[PDB]
Design a protein around this ligand. Structure first.
Ligand SMILES: Cc1ncc(COP(=O)(O)O)c(CN[C@@H](CO)C(=O)O)c1O
Ligand SMILES: Cc1ncc(COP(=O)(O)O)c(CN[C@@H](CO)C(=O)O)c1O
Ligand code: NA
Ligand code: NA
Ligand code: NA
Lengths: 384, 382
């Protein structure tokens, strides 16, 4: 339940039962032969795993310091890492006898991933999405509709991701006998932070085998963007006990950390409770969760998962921020230099890795998690 | 040079030297270990090959006949099979000492693939695109620009794909010393039909190993959409000498074969010489095609398909806009895969064919691309 002081299960009594049933089923199926056979079968044949590890040679030589490798989650079916978790949980839900999936989404990538997994397994899918987010994600909303899902616009509160989560929790209270709430990041009440990290850890396990193949040794640094924290936990987790491997999480710096328009929960937030968890949140003086800002629509969650709060506290991982400007610069740079158009979320990680590589030796190795592709962001990049 | 009577190299004398230089370079490099080292390295680590072969269980059960497997070229970097050929030819060009790639594109996928390959290998890229196509492919034009390529609108003729090819040929004639014309399908003068097919044959080589792993036997039928014909040749070619494997190419039937608003060159075209090759073309003058699928816009077809049709090694059919759009929706809802509108033609035909076959028989459908590029077309139609 806990990662030191962070995490927990801060929910009404009506969700204790459902969460207990979920934890029970997860413990039964996580190491089950048939569950893992099916999961790996879908990840391979439908999602296209393993994704490659790409040496960005041109980008590396241009900067003139450390080698930059890219873990290519942009190539997963759906165009982002979210699919890995969507399949895992959707299959778990099917084996628990559930017939319906609900999920929140901000950027729309988790919504699409959930709609895809639901279609694959023959389940109903309703996606809760803040009305502000529906308005700016027309194409992802259309993708979800083509996949057979219904997108439910959320008009309560600030009409954003935090509000979508609140409506989904309210739905799940009444519908849990037949509905699984498919949370999309390492957030929410226990057991969700643990489950989502476990279903994304395939990223790190592949990346470890692939870097040993390419370089014969573990990397010096792993860099990943951090919204709620799932792509970062996925690549980090298999290296946590390799003590010489530095772990760097990159939050959205927005218009700057001192501007009050960013999504850097670990950097600038405070401890608090929301969505069932004790973690870091951007909060005002009256304990209200604040709206976050980022040019990357997927770095929109005002909190961060408790396992990242914990890794920061024990100083196992370092957390930094990169601005909208720096992320954009990286979006263009990677597109031009390596012929890969990254998601704006992922461009934050690329932006930091480029800064860091310049300060490091040519013998050293950085792995960047490229959490998604940039096709979804083309209009945003045009406008900025 | 020829596939039966089809193909050849019917070009002005100014193109003969350049084509002979390309032929010689290709013969040198095609089985060279060093060339193949670099090509396989980029296909694996950058493009993400091999793509999976997926058993569409829900689609199969619903139809109630043959097993339907999908070769997942939708998962290749860039979202379509075009990348396989773009990398192979861009690398060839690089090794020949060229500094610039030019390419035609209609739908914009070959344009993007060429832009990506050029960015990867440090080569200038100019994409010729008919002004009518530039106009309705806003996002692909923008992906190309983000990738560092210049898009040159074509305002001559009908301002579509055939005219882009004409302009690119005029450019290449002048600039071939340092420019490679990176043709996107199995069309044009020898050696292009052969080169493009060879660079797409990885699709079939994977699919063969994958179906032997999954089912312990070769498939009964392979189904692929046919524009110029590259994704179909890619998956077909490694099975040509497996006598019991049926090969089915699916052309764009458009508004219906009787309407004359389609792109079914093999079904309803006439044999003739154009773009340096003897093949089937729609027409007395060659006309622009119609299809809901922007990628099935070439008025002609590759000469190797003309040949397979004539010897009856492959069967060719047509699927309408309406049927393709139905299949786009069906695959999205039933399997959670949004296909390209081009590929949806193959899916549509495969669904018709599977119904008539037994439950132990196997169809492989080539899913040539993903449908993200077609979302606005499908929004307007539906
Ligand atoms: C491509 C990509 N990369 C990174 C992230 C950040 O999330 P993570 O920190 O859980 O990986 C997201 C989040 N996207 C979420 C939240 O808005 C969604 O609902 O789609 C993403 O879409
Ligand atoms: C996804 C997809 N599937 C199929 C085809 C048909 O081409 P083929 O028959 O050469 O495979 C295309 C063609 N696309 C070409 C022609 O317009 C282009 O310039 O982009 C495509 O983009
Ligand atoms: Na792959
Ligand atoms: Na945050
Ligand atoms: Na045609």
């Amino acid at each position: 339940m806990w990662f030191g002081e962070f995490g927990g299960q801060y929910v009404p009594e009506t969700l204790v039962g459902p969460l207990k049933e979920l934890e029970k089923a997860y413990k039964r199926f996580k190491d089950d032969e048939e569950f893992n056979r099916q999961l790996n079968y879908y990840l391979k044949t439908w999602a296209g795993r393993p994704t490659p590890l790409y040496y960005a040679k041109r980008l590396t030589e241009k900067i003139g310091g450390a080698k930059v490798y890219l873990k290519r989650e942009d190539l997963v079916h759906g165009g982002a890492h979210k699919t890995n978790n969507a399949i895992g949980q959707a299959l778990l839900a099917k084996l628990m006898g559930k017939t319906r999936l609900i999920a929140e989404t901000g950027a729309g990538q988790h919504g699409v991933a959930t709609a895809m997994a639901g279609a694959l397994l023959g389940m109903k899918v309703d996606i809760y999405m803040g009305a502000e987010d529906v308005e700016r994600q027309k194409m992802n909303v259309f993708r979800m509709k083509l996949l057979g899902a219904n997108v439910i616009p959320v008009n309560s509160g600030s009409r954003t991701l935090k509000d979508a989560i609140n409506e989904a929790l309210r739905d799940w209270v009444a519908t849990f006998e037949y509905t699984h709430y498919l949370i999309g990041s390492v957030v929410g009440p226990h057991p969700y932070p643990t489950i989502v990290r476990d279903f994304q850890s395939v990223i790190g396990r592949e990346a470890k085998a692939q870097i040993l193949e390419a370089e014969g040794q573990l990397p010096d640094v792993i860099v990943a963007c951090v919204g709620g924290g799932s792509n970062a936990m996925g690549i980090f987790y298999p290296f946590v006990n390799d003590k010489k491997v530095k772990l760097v999480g990159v939050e959205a710096g927005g218009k700057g950390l001192e501007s009050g328009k960013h999504s850097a929960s670990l950097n600038a937030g405070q401890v608090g409770v929301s969505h069932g968890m004790l973690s870091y949140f951007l909060q005002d003086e009256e304990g209200q969760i604040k709206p976050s800002h980022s040019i990357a629509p997927g770095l929109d969650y005002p909190g961060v998962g408790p396992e990242h709060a914990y890794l920061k506290k024990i100083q196992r991982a370092e957390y930094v921020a990169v601005t909208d400007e720096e992320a954009l610069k990286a979006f263009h740079e990677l597109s031009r230099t390596e012929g890969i158009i990254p998601a704006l979320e992922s461009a934050h990680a690329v932006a930091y890795a480029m800064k860091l590589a310049k300060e490091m030796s040519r013998d050293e190795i950085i792995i960047v998690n490229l959490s998604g592709r940039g096709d979804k962001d083309l209009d945003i990049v045009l406008k900025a």
